Every structure is written in C-alpha cells, then in structure tokens.
Design a protein around this nucleic acid. Structure first.
Lengths: 124, 262, 185
RNA sequence: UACCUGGUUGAUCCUGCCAGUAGCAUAUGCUUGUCUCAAAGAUUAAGCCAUGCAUGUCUAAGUACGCACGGCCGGUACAGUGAAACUGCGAAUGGCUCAUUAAAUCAGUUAUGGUUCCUUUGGUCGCUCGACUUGGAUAACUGUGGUAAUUCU
RNA sequence: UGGUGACUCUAGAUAACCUCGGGCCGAUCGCACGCCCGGCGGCGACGACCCAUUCGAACGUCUGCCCUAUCAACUUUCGAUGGUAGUCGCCGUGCCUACCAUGGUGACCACGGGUGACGGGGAAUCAGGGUUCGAUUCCGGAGAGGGAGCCUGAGAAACGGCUACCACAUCCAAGGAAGGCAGCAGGCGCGCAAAUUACCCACUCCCGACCCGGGGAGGUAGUGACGAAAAAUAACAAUACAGGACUCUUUCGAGGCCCUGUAAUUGGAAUGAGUCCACUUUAAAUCCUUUAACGAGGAUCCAUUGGAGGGCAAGUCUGGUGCCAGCAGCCGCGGUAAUUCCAGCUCCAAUAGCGUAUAUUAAAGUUGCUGCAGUUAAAAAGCUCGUAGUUGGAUCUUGGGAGCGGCCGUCCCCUGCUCGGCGCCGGCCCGAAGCGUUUACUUUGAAAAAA
C-alpha cells in the first residue's frame, strides 16, 4: 500500500539527470527503505534502478507521508561522473581510503622534516 | 586588514541575493570583474538559488566546467563570476537565454529572452576618453573599453552592442521623455520616462522620472539607465514592468489571483 | 563566526505583584475552566493579547487613510478573523480593544476538542491530544496549545492511527485479550 | 498595566531615606522525566605553556633520462601513470583576543582634479625605419661526509 | 580633438633625455591538423608595457564621545601655528630640513589626569521622557610576552616570516641549537567565574597550476538547568459520602430523571518515559521523526524549591527550647501558652524548576527636559556691581477676482530679464537653463549594509 508521487520535477540537461521531490504515502507502517523507493521510481519512469540516486527523507510527524529528493541519470557513467562520491558509496561503487585525517596530518608534518626522495621513506 | 579580503560573510552579503541565514557562515564572494561586489549576482547564486539546476556549490563547479554556461557571448568557468545588469546568460545545452534585469523589488529575476534577443545587449557609458593618438574611447557600466565610437554618444547615454563582435549598433541619448530603468537606491527596478534633469554643480545631479501610472519619483543620475527612445523599450520587460504597485495593491492582486484561481 | 540563529524571545511576562488575591483568583478560574497546567500558560495568552493590543493602539495614533494604518490594520483584523476570535461584522480595529483572554482559550485545540464533543471533559481532551489521538486534516496534532483557525475547525477528529478512530486496539486491550486467552488455554 | 507597600509617633499629618516588588545577567545552592534551539577561560592573569593539529597547491596546456610503475608500428627525440626537485602562485585571507587607544578609534557625510592597486573584465600587444629557436649554471638523482643535537648542511 | 562646476585635464605639435642596480615591442606550452607549387591558417593556455574596470587600501572634509577644575591656562629655537624653497614619500601636507614670520588652542571647558574605555550596528529595562550595558559571532580598528628594526611581495613594519635587545623558559656530550596557543583541543596558574588532547572536508566558502588536492575557516558530535520555545507526572466510569436544581416534608426522610466534588474502594480502556530489533537521518554516525515487540495501579516510573506575624498568598494546630539555640532583606519573634526558633501534620506560591549573593533597569516626580525641591524638614551667596552664558516690548500684506457643493467649506491668481512652440502681422501668449538676502523652523525628495 506504499504510494510514491513526484513533485517539483526538473530535467538538468547540464548535469544529464531528471531531479524531483519524492513524496511517499505509507500510513500505519514504518519509513520504507531507499531500495523500495528506487524500485518504484524505476517502473514509474521506465528506467534501470542503478541510475536512480534517492536521499534526504524527513518523515512528517504522525507518519503517513515522507518527503525526500530523488534524481534519475541518463546512464551509469553519467551517475559515477557528476554525483557526490559518498552517495555513490551507498551503492557500493565508490570506496574511500581507510586512514582517518589525524594520521594523514601527522604523516604530512613528518614528511615536512626530511628533504628529497626520503619523504617516501617516512611511512613503510 | 593588511591586504585585500578574500571571504564574504553570509550576513554581510547584499540583501538582493536573497541568501538564507542558516546554511553557511560564508557567502560566495564575487570574483573581481565587470560589475561591482554589491551590484552583481554571482553565477553560482543564479545557477543554484534562482534556477535551482544544482543543489550544492560543487554541482555548480561540475555544470560550469562542462562549459555549458556563456555570459554575454563568452564561456566563463568561474562559479563566483560577477554577472550584473543587462548581462545575457546563455545556457546552450538546455537551449535557454536569460537577461539580468531588476524585478520591481531590488533583486535580479529569472527573465527568459529569445535566442534573437540574446545576441545584443544594452550598455550605459561611464566616461568618454581620448586615447594615445586622438582615438576616442567609451567605457561602459561593465568595463568595455570600446574605441572609435560615434561622436554624438556622451556620458549617461546607452549603446546597443552585438555580443559576437562587440561593436555598437544603435544608441539612446540621455534626453527627456526617454524610458529609464533605475539601477541603484530605493527605486531599484522602477521603469519610467525621464521628465526632468536637475543640475547641481559639484554635488550629485538628481533626475525626476514619471511612471506608466503617473507615479513620479526622483533618483540620483548615477543610478539611472535608459532602455528605449520615447515609450518603446529596446529589451523585453519582466511582469510588473517596473511600475511598482504599492504593498496595499500587491496584497489586493495576490489575494485576487489566489481566490480566483483556487 | 558559526552558522546558527540565536534569535529567541520570551512568550510570557510574570506579573508585578506576585500575591494579589484577586489576580490569583481570576487566573486559577481561567486554568480550571479551560484545563491549563500552570500560570505561565495564562500569562502567555495574556502577552499574545497585549502584543496585539499594543499594535492596535499604535495604529489608532495614526490618521485614517494612512496607507501603513490601512494595510497593517486590515492585516491584524484578517489575522484575528482567521483564528476565529473577532467576528466579520466587528473587523474595525477599535473592537480589538474590546477583546478578552477567554476568547483565545476558546480557540485552544484542547477546548475545541472538548466543545466539539469528541472528548468527555477539558482534562480528558488534553490527555487525547498529548497521547496523539486527534488529527487536523490527516495531521496528528500532539500539542493542546494549537490555536485552531476558523478555516480549520470542522476538520478536527480522531487520527486514523488511533483506537478511538478506526485504529489498531491499544496496549491494555491487547494484553487483556492475551490474559483472557492465557487463562482459558 | 502610566501601580506601589512595611518601618521614626502615645496617636496624627509630612519630609525623607531604609526594606520590600518585577525584570535583566554573572556566580552559586538544592532539584531535574521528555523534546527543540543555544551561550560557554570576556571580567581575575594581553599570565605561563608539555604534546598533537591549525597553509598548502598540477592541468591536455612551465620543467620528467627516479625503470617507482608501464604499451609496442620505434630509430623523425618525447607513449601514458607519475614520487621527488625546480618554477609559478598562495602563505597579507581565515581564526583568536580587547592590551593599548578619549576628536584618537568609530559612525553618518564628502573627497581623491592629491594617491597606489597581484587579480578579474575590456582595451592595447607588424604604430619604433634599425634566428627553422641563442648562453651556462643549478636542484631532484648518483656518490663521499661532518656535528651530541635542528625542517643543520 | 574630447570632457568637467572648475585642470597646470585628455589629446596635438616642437625640442630633446633614455637611469648598465637597464619600461614595452612573445627565443613559452597544449588540442585537432588542414588547404595550397617549402609558404599560409583554426581553437586555446601562459606571459606582458600602458590605459580603463573590479577588489580594495591610504590620506583628507563636515558633524557627533564618558568622568574630572583638589587639572586654568597650555603649545614653542629636540616644530608649536603659519610662509618660501627643497628632502623624503605612492601621492596632499611641518612628514622632515634650511631661512623667515609669532603665531595656534581655551570658560562654547583648551591643556593635564582618570576610565572595571576598543568604537559602531546593537542589548537590558522603559507610559511619555530616560537610565544602564555593548570583552562577545556583522562592520571598522588594534595586537600577537614587551619595545624596536627589516626581508620578500601587488599588498606586511607579517610574528603558525626574519634580526636584535629586555623578560621568562626548553634540549645539551657545556661546544652550541631551538622558542612564541590573545588559532583548535589540552595543561598549570589565577580565581566567585567558563566544555573534548573527538569526527569530517559531506554542507558553507576560501586557497592552488586546480572538475580531482588542502583547509581545528567551517560543518558534525561530546560536556552544557547561560538563557529561550513546546510539554508527562495521569484520564474516564461505577460504588461508598456532601450540596443543589425540582416534587414532597413546617424541619426529618425519599425520588433521582440532571450533576458537581473525593476515598491506598473496585473496574476496565489509554499513552509516554525506558528497553529495543528495522528503516530514515548522516561523510560515518548520534538526536528527533517512523515503526514491529516489550513497557503503568500505592500507575514506588513516588516534584521539587521556598515560605505560612505583617509587608505578601498561606495554621493563633501539637511536641521541644526558654533573650539560650536560633529566626529575621524591614518592622521585629525568642525571658516556659513562641501564629516568627527546631520539628510533626496541614496549608500557600511558582513548578521541571525554585532559592541565595552581586552589578544593573523600572519602582525614583528619591537627579526632576517632560518633572522635584530651598520660611520652619537638607537647602537663597552678607550685599551690590559686573564680562562671557542665558532670555529679551510693540511695530513693515491686506482686501479681493473666479468656479463647484448644500450664507458657509476646498480649489486657481496678486517680481523681472539667451534659446524655443498653440502661433500671429521686430513685438506679444507660453515653456526650458541661468540670475534673483542670510539662516533657524517645518514639509517633501535623494541617499543611508546586513543581522
């Protein structure tokens, strides 16, 4: 019984996407996960679910309505080109470095000590 | 400070950008360019706040570095480029063309113009200069040093340049009965016929302007721009037509439009 | 240099004389009658009135056919007509002065839930709202202070997700059903 | 909301202050279930500071002979990924504090016809009448080192 | 030639000069590459003299600041105010020289001193006035332990640059080397008085050669009763009990069609705190929101903090103490009946808050402009003169011409002298720029950052 409407619809020809406001009615039951939103937006606009990036849902008080922002890209390469790399990482097709920034700071400051090729000899 | 400032605080940003309070400490500080800091509207604010093609200022970096944006006939790739008055933003892949004309309130609005209209723009001259070999020079309100102009063109006249070539086609001379967009002060966005010039040796010359509903008002001559000979403008005008309905009449028309529509 | 607001005002004013017998009398009358919880709740309705009243008197110093006074006046009147405190016959701004604290407590959503007969008492009505039973146009209002508009009055009813409406039976009934089945076998 | 009230007397009317009254913003006491905003080493010591971090930066487009990686139609040099180093730019902004400072600072108001201005934007860039690309250093690199010690050389 | 209100402006012409510590006129790089009997060309990147523009910055204009007279004269041949000519400076100028002149400021408060003084936008109180505060997120200024000097650069007298001195302090193999948290954390000290040696460049913007890197700037969490908003701590029946509409009864008593109240009385229905999978949120999380499942009877899931003589809402209740202990902002209570102490019960006030200390605003018409006082309550100089200061008599345009509404009310009028347009046979009617006592006052207009 999950209805999903689209609102304030736009076509960015300059970012190669559709972008719209997803409006999910689901009275009685929990906030529905993004996977059910993507799969319903997919068959709503007759597109692959892989090009659909869906985020920023804040459920109204009472909870028979959530409003989030969606966008449907033209291709897979267009998705991976001009999308925030963190929102790719919800789909597993961006992985970032394990290091926390304090190691990278202290590394940089240790490399500032030695001159020449010996800066590679700070770590390992 | 002991050199130039490179940041603009969100609160200290000009009111006509209509930037919100709560999103960020900083506003986009306009890069140096043709228009003044507090008289321009950066590309970023046009591209992500007015038109909402972006969401963030990193999306605006992706749009502009695809070279899809073309301000007054040349592609810029600066998100904080000062796009100001009478400038023509041509977003070419969408097939759209926008003129930065002041709405009846002091903001710049989303005024869509036709691809034919988007080929020329109108420029107020700031001074007449005589160059290094008797060469006459104009300087426009957007820093265009146009050399060998028509000798009848004087300061406070407007000239119609063609973007592609950068050469003058026509010009309105600053004379009474000519249309006037007000581009500074309390009357920012008014359109009316110039009815009186009032000279002041030393001090600032003031100019009375009658409107399309007989609403006469004054303005400093610095803050004036002529947009057509007599009563016919050389640009397309936004709704309101710089006539400036009062807040009582604004309330009336907004209420009439809401109740009648449903 | 942080990107925060800091903007905040008080909604009440504590009275000058703290132990006026006649004031303690009349404010406890208002609390008991309209089922409020503290003197701050009366003092804030009194302060909303005093703001409206101060604005109205400021407009009465200005001459008639003053465009500020006409615009600001008509706006303040329309605001009072909307919330259902001032009648449409009485939208002249010298009738705002002839206006009392009781008329704003009448528009309190606790007192409207009572007077629309979907609560038994004024104290029951607060329980229902505070236990998110009622809705105003498919919007569950949890908070009894909701000033109900004249536009928005007849759309007050029970929430679809509440057992006093067409909702799932509550925690007590469902335990008493499990007790009734546990006892038998 | 344009408000007072207790106290000199045996009692009275006064002057008149003390004390009550309500905020507000610092401290502190006791108490504290939910939820939304949010101040927070200013006052005293612009006192002293261990340690870590806070300004760095590469595009097709200044400089690539580190095999650190790496393709094959190579002899008409240089595929491409590129650490380091040179070069350019930034480091004069941001942040912090309120010691100094009383026509100073600052505010409104003008002036710059009395000046400077990286950057940006638009001009100018065969306007002068007289080599089909020049010179030799230096750094990374390689290799000998010194001092207890430094982002030393 | 062009321009301003005004140039010793811009441009023009002549004569020359050209800093060897030296203005420009390209020995630079990348894309796609073609046409032409080797030449010629597109699209850029970078660099550059000069001009304009932008971002500014600097120095000036007018006006505006707290207390102080137990600060009345100050400034001046180590510049004080001017003039002339230089030096220096980016330029203007005692900025600095040299030579002249003797000026400049002051009771309209100069000069000196104080400030628990960075200034402003602003904040708190506030009837009308005012009073107080503003270290603090925006603007402007200043400083980086104290002074000082300078390098580089467009921009610094830079301190996350350098060089000294003074102060304090760190390694040391005793020869030396290194320092600057009024950056973010954090430590000590100081105190009445103030949080994590957290996460992140995802948002906001900034910097760079840059779609890609970096940012304790910033964002996000932690501590957080500074303060502000919303808002639980129960609700509803039926029984015990007490009053009333209403009938009856003189009063009792009954009926309850109608309640209204409270009993560790019974009863079901409720929901949130809390626990907690799952989503959502997010850079990754958290909190909220959404949601399964649990989760309330002395609903022990237990509301406090101050008071109960008056001012000031609320016990002349009981026990203890006996001018003791103590309470008490004030008046006062305490000496054996304490409505005032210390307690029990009860009640009052505000309530997730409430008391106390202290600065401060109103109250204070107890600083008085609004607006106070001065015979006797504190207060008019012993008296007069007197210069600033303050305040100053009367008197100089009035009666009309014209129209609308039903004698009255609003409206139009009581200065002249280059060029044009309602035009007419050099003039007249009309418009435009200029000339036309000085202000104060009032009215309008321009302009004045946001928050």
């Amino acid at each position: 019984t999950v209805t999903i409407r689209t609102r304030k619809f736009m076509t960015n020809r300059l970012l190669q996407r559709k972008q719209m406001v997803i409006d999910v009615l689901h009275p009685g039951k929990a906030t529905v996960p993004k996977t059910e939103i993507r799969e319903k937006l997919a068959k709503m606009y007759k597109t692959t679910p892989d090009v659909i990036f869906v985020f920023g849902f804040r459920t109204h008080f009472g909870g028979g309505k959530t409003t989030g922002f969606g966008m449907i890209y033209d291709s897979l390469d267009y998705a991976k080109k001009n999308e925030p790399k963190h929102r790719l990482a919800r789909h597993g097709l961006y992985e970032k470095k394990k290091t926390s920034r304090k190691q990278r700071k202290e590394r940089k400051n240790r490399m500032k000590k030695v001159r020449g090729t010996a800066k590679a000899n700070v770590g390992a | 400070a002991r050199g130039p400032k490179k940041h603009l605080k969100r609160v200290a940003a000009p009111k006509h950008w209509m930037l919100d309070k709560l999103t960020s400490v900083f506003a986009p500080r306009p890069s140096t360019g043709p228009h003044k800091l507090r008289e321009c509207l950066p590309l970023i604010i046009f591209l992500r706040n007015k038109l909402k093609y972006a969401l963030t200022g990193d999306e605006v970096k992706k749009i502009c570095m695809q070279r899809f944006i073309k301000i007054d006939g040349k592609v810029r790739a600066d998100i904080t480029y000062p796009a100001g008055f009478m400038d023509v933003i041509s977003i070419d892949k969408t097939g759209e063309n926008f003129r930065l004309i002041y709405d009846t309130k002091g903001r710049f609005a989303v005024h869509r113009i036709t691809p034919e209209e988007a080929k020329y723009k109108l420029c107020k001259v700031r001074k007449i200069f005589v160059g290094t070999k008797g060469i006459p020079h104009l300087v426009t309100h957007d820093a265009r040093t146009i050399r060998y102009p028509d000798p009848l063109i004087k300061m406070n006249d407007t000239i119609q340049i063609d973007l592609e070539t950068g050469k003058i086609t026509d010009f309105i001379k600053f004379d009474t009965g000519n249309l006037c967009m007000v581009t500074g002060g309390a009357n920012l966005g008014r359109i009316g016929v110039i009815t009186n010039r009032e000279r002041h040796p030393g001090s600032f010359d003031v100019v009375h302007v009658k409107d399309a509903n007989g609403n006469s008002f004054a303005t400093r001559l610095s803050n004036i721009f002529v947009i057509g000979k007599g009563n016919k403008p050389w640009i397309s005008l936004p709704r309101g037509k710089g006539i400036r309905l009062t807040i009582a009449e604004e309330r009336d028309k907004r209420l009439a439009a809401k109740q009648s529509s449903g | 240099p942080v990107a925060r607001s800091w903007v905040c005002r008080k909604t009440y004013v504590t009275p000058r004389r703290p132990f006026e017998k006649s004031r303690l009398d009349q404010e406890l009358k208002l609390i008991g009658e309209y089922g409020l919880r503290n003197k701050r709740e009366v003092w804030r309705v009194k302060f909303t009135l005093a703001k409206i009243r101060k604005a109205a008197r400021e407009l009465l110093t200005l001459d008639e056919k003053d465009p500020r006074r006409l615009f600001e006046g008509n706006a303040l009147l329309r605001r009072l007509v909307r919330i259902g405190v001032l009648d449409e016959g009485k939208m002249k701004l010298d009738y705002i002065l002839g206006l009392k604290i009781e008329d704003f407590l009448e528009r309190r959503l606790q007192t409207q839930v009572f007077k629309l007969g979907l609560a038994k008492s004024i104290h029951h009505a607060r329980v229902l709202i505070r236990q998110r039973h009622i809705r105003v146009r498919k919007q569950v209002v949890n908070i009894p202070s909701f000033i109900v508009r004249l536009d928005s009055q007849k759309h007050i009813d029970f929430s679809l997700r509440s057992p006093y409406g067409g909702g799932r039976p509550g925690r007590v009934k469902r335990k008493n059903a499990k007790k009734g089945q546990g006892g038998a076998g």
